[PDB]
């Protein structure tokens, strides 16, 4: 069995697919889920970030701005406001969204930094 894990933006979708490991970030600290595991509503956090493992191939890296977990019987959809590829952040655009005031951008540069590798 997978996990089908679906990444959608209020704007666009991002991704879409199965995975055979994932895990996330909510108001109750991070979480692991399973392709074998019961329904769930959790609230991602402001600079959460999904990590989609592929069976055979090299998980994703993706950083959600303040988006959602579903999962279902055996389905899983996360919406958010936006999604960024580990590939596409840049080292010097998340350590100076990070550096930001504003909770906006303080919250996408830190999302950004996560996925990057950077911790809490």
């Known amino acids: 069995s997978e996990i089908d894990v679906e990444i959608v933006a209020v704007e666009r979708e991002i991704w ?3 995975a055979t490991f994932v895990f ?3 108001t109750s600290g991070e979480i692991g889920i399973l392709p074998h595991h019961i329904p769930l509503v959790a ?3 402001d600079d959460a970030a999904v990590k ?3 069976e055979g191939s090299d998980d994703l890296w993706w950083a959600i701005d303040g988006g959602f977990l579903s999962i279902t019987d055996t389905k ?3 919406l958010a406001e936006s999604a960024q590829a580990r590939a596409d952040i840049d080292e010097a655009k998340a350590k100076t969204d990070s550096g930001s ?3 906006r951008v303080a919250a996408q540069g830190r999302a950004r930094l996560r ?3 950077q911790t809490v």
Do not use: F, H, M, N
């Open 115 to 117: 996925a990057l590798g």
């Open 43 to 45: 609230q991602l956090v």
């Open 101 to 103: 005031e504003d909770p």
């Open 16 to 18: 879409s697919g199965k």
């Open 24 to 26: 996330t970030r909510t």
């Open 76 to 78: 899983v959809s996360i």
């Open 52 to 54: 989609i493992e592929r």
